[PDB]
Amino acid sequence: GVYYILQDSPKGNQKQRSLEDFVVSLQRVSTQHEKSQ
Amino acid sequence: EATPGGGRVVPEDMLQTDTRVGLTSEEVVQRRRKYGLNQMKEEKENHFLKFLGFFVGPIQFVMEGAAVLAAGLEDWVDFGVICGLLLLNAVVGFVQEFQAGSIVDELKKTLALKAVVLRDGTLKEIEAPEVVPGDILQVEEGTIIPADGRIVTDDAFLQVDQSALTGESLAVDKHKGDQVFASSAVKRGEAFVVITATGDNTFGHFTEVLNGIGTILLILVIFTLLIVWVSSFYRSNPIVQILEFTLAITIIGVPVGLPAVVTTTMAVGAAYLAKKKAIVQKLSAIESLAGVEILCSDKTGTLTKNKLSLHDPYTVAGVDPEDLMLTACLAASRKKKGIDAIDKAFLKSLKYYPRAKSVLSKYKVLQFHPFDPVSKKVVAVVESPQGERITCVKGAPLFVLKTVEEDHPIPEEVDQAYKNKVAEFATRGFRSLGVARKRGEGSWEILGIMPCMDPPRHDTYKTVCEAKTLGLSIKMLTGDAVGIARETSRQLGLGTNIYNAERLGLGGGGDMPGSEVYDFVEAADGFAEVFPQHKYNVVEILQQRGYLVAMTGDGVNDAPSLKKADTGIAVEGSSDAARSAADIVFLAPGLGAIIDALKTSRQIFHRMYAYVVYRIALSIHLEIFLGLWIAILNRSLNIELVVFIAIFADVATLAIAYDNAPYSQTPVKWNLPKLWGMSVLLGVVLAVGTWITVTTMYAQGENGGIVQNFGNMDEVLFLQISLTENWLIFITRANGPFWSSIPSWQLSGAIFLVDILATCFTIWGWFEHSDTSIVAVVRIWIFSFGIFCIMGGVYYILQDSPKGNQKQRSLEDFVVSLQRVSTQHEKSQ
Amino acid sequence: GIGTILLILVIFTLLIVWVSSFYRSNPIVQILEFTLAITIIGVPVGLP
Amino acid sequence: DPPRHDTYKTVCEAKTLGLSIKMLTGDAVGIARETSRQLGLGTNIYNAE
Ligand SMILES: Nc1ncnc2c1ncn2[C@@H]1O[C@H](COP(=O)(O)OP(=O)(O)O)[C@@H](O)[C@H]1O
Ligand SMILES: Nc1ncnc2c1ncn2[C@@H]1O[C@H](COP(=O)(O)OP(=O)(O)O)[C@@H](O)[C@H]1O
Ligand SMILES: [K+]
Ligand SMILES: [Mg+2]
């Protein structure tokens, strides 16, 4: 009975969404600069 | 002292009585004041005032008072053992200092700034100090000026790199007859120097941690002594017994030779590193290298070889069918003793039939602008048999077009093909070089690109792979364009986030918000088209985020970056100034040597940290055992036994500097709060074990507790303390569980011998009045092993994106913005 | 990791047993019997 | 007008004393910035007006 009793959308806060946005943005700007106008 | 201190015409103008090339007969010079005047030779090899120096001090005075207050030389039991301990500490300290001073000088010898003077023949070079004053000198493009003095009559300007002894960091361009300052570099130039004031008017971090640790240990010993003296005053103990107690606690508490053995560990590690072809400038660079998190290394010479492969020059151009080879080789310095890596490949690949023999004849050079890093472009003006002034230009493929944009300005037919071909050779991992020629006064044809290629070193890929497991993050620095750098990153598995340095904001920004230029620099796999100033800016930015940066320097251009970096690494083939400004000088090429030195430095730091934790843990252990036992019960260990406990802690420690210590998988640093927490907990565990041992004999009598048949409290405590204290080193010198790495035979033997001696002490009891049973020592060994296991388990259990909040990003943005507005206003509309 | 933590638990139990036997001055044979029983029960021989 | 021969080291030691020296020049920004570079005073010079 003890074993049975204890047996039991944007997935991000500001930090997580900011981190993913930064990752994708740095990828894009790296590509953009690498194009070298 | 200028005129009356060894300077006048006969060491000044009698120098310039011969030609430029020639020097003979250092005659009777009467004074060789050359070897770092009265610094290393000061009181040469005293070798006997260091020995007595270790016999005088605060603790040594306490031991002398102890040895005197033992009724003088009445009996050689207390006096003998106390003087033996004092002599052992003095001898160990002397030997350790001798070893540490006899091996840091061997690294200084292999790194001295050798000085070149040219005589009648091709004299090789002169070892640094033993050069006569008032003698010629040849300072050549990044050499530390060996001797102070003035320039020779020949006309040329050398830009001396200053702010090492003066203020301004800009070009200090002394031209003729000015005061050339010793121990200073030359950014560029070719001049000769006359020596004046050959030795006159020449105008780490683990040590501080050790000093703080020693101060806190002194505080702890004073607190224990205060407890002992107070508790003896309440019991009205005679002064002699109080003095015995305070002597025992002084012996156990203050570590006599902690900084000495730490410096010995550093010196042995530095010697081992120099064996691995990595010479360390200052002994503190070991810890700095162990702590680095980001290694910003130049691609050329470190991540790739300096020999280039040439693949089918792109001779698809206008009227010019094959002039690429001829005009490119026209811009060769052809010294073959100071030429760079680029120059060699042109000559080695001159297997051209039509004119390669006739192209190197009569093309007399008039002007030869050297390769300027800010321009990435070498420009030469030479003569031709036709009489024209062929001004060859060679550099980055885009920069040559930027040069030729004036005449024949950017035709769409050729410019598009040129850009497409340079992009294609970037995709093929080829370094490209463009050449433009000047026949007349109004002709500028574009010749084409030269697809050179320098493959990465055969050990570079796996070295970079393993460097990611070591916690490092390698940031490549290329003067190449972004495409070549990105293809090299793909080849090396270095990740492809390469940003042009000028565009990103290193220096004059491109209105990029300051909070995000720092973020881009921090999370960047490389930096293409980098100038010398961008290196310093990258180092400055990366340290703001809280990193320890190791820079790969080579040449005089990156000297300020090497100084600013936490660990400036002078790579193979560096100039004298680069290695003088660096922290570690390497005599082997490639990133493999750097990573091996990193691992070795981490091992050395692990040895140091393990010993420090050992020493302060057993100090806390034995002080909070003996002081508490004196306070509670007015009893303490026999003075001979406690002296031998101290001795055994100086025998199992002269071997820690020589063992197979593992290296951390992450950059290692002094976490002083965690160090103190771990050591206090280990000492408390040891003290609890010892208190259990003694309270067993209180509970069940002197020969009935932890002892089975017979014994005595003092020798049993001696054995237990010795075993549990010396075995503590096996758990501090490990990554996680103590059974991970096998200790070296030296440490294991030195500790097992001490354990055997302690066991013999207990069995025969030859410093107290009774012996101990052979089964009692077995039980003590079992209990000590249990304490060792629980202590090791405690040690093992407790062993283990924008990097900013609003405040940090705002601060970085404000810094960059104020820099930009200062520049903007300084422009003054 | 689980085996390491189980070893730590067995060592803690053995330390309790040895300390409590020392305070009672048990003969070494009885202490060895106790430690053998707890070694047998504590460490799982064939978990992995 | 060259800086005094003791000025550079005085400014260097003034940073260890906790001070932060702010120069005030009636000169233009360029001359002030070059003087700051000479003296090791740091180059963030703003026109007052
Ligand atoms: N001696 C040279 N003559 C002409 N172009 C050169 C020379 N050395 C380098 N370059 C070109 O300048 C760019 C990079 O030079 P650099 O900044 O020297 O690369 P590294 O800094 O990695 O040595 C590349 O386009 C390279 O081909
Ligand atoms: N007596 C003067 N006659 C002409 N111009 C002057 C005179 N004194 C200063 N100046 C100029 O005025 C500007 C700064 O003057 P000032 O405000 O006097 O500098 P400081 O305040 O540092 O003495 C500089 O351009 C300087 O050359
Ligand atoms: K440094
Ligand atoms: Mg380079």
Author numbering:
A (entry chain A): 873 to 880, 892 to 920
B (entry chain F): 66 to 268, 284 to 880, 892 to 920
C (entry chain A): 292 to 339
D (entry chain E): 534 to 582
Authors' text:
The plasma membrane of fungal and plant cells contains a proton-pumping P-type adenosine triphosphatase (ATPase) that maintains the intracellular pH and generates a proton-motive force, driving the import of nutrients by secondary transporters. Unlike any other known P-type ATPase, Pma1 is a hexamer that localizes to specific ordered microdomains in the fungal plasma membrane. Autoinhibited Pma1 hexamers in the plasma membrane of starving fungi are activated by glucose signaling and subsequent phosphorylation of the autoinhibitory domain.
We collected single-particle cryo-EM data of the hexameric form of Pma1 from Neurospora crassa plasma membrane in its autoinhibited state and obtained a hexamer map at 3.28-Å resolution. The Pma1 hexamer forms a ring with sixfold symmetry, with a maximum outer diameter of 167 Å and an inner cavity measuring 24 to 55 Å in diameter in the cytosolic and transmembrane regions, respectively. Specifically, there are two connections between the cytosolic domains: a loose contact between the conserved Thr-Gly-Glu-Ser (TGES) loop in the A domain (residues 231 to 235) and two α-helix termini in the P domain (Tyr541, Arg570, and Gln571). The second, more extensive contact between the P domains of adjacent monomers is mediated entirely via the autoinhibitory R domain (and see further discussion below). R domains of adjacent monomers interact directly: Ser892 and Pro893 interact with Leu902 of the adjacent R helix, thereby linking all R domains within the hexamer. Opposite this dip, on the inside of the ring, the cytosolic membrane surface bulges upward toward the P domain, probably attracted by the partial positive charge at the N-terminal end of M3 and by Lys749 in the L6-L7 loop. We find no structural basis for cooperativity between the monomers in the hexamer, but the structure implies that autoinhibition is enhanced by—if not dependent on—a hexamer context.
